[PDB]
Amino acid sequence: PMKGRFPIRRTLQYLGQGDVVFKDSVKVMTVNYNTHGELGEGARKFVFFNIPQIQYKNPWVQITMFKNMTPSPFLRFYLDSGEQVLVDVESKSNKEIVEHIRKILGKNEETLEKEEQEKKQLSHPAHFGPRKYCLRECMCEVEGQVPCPGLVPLPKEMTGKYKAALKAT
């Protein structure tokens, strides 16, 4: 787009390139940050940039931002078990915040790979049906098998009218 300070962050590619996936126990991320002082430049840049990337890959996690109540910027992760994860961000940078969050509460590369390997199993290559869920519609189009009657007409010996005609006489 054109409107906005950074039009790039409002694109599907930017939202998809941010790889931060929370665990199933993660429910709430409450970020508290200030709008003044040189200490909180990293927290402000984190709120400006990385919140959309985290939100895109965690749609069910509620993220709430708060401004100018606590003098120290921090994050509070509310889990399913009730444990509150307190993350102090005073001089951390924008990339350091993301790396710290992924370290403390996130999903490993192998964990993501096993989920996607399970997901690709649902679509099965040998199944038949519509093009949305299956690769083949009718089994005629397979090379070695009988062609589709709407493309190559079948011989008179395989048509049902000739079989009825021969039985009639």
Q: Which residues of the shown chain bind another protein in the complex (CB under 8 A)?
A: 1, 3-4, 10-12, 15, 27-28, 30, 34, 36, 51-52, 55-56, 60, 62-64, 66, 68-72, 74, 76, 78-80, 82-83, 85-88, 90-91, 100, 103-105, 124, 126-129, 138-140, 144-146, 148-150, 154, 158-160
Q: Which of 54, 49, 41, 47 is nearest to 92 (CA)?
A: 41
Instruction: For 147-156, give one letter per residue: b (16+ CB within 10 A) or e.
Output: eeeeeeeeee
Can residue 167 be called a binding residue for RNA (CB under 7 A)?
no
- The DSSP letter of residue 11 is S
Region from 17-25, 71-79, 92-100, 152-160 binding RNA, contact rule CB under 7 A: 152-160
- CB 87, CB 75: distance < 8 Å: yes
Enumerate the known binding-site residues for [2Fe-2S] cluster. Answer: 138, 140, 148
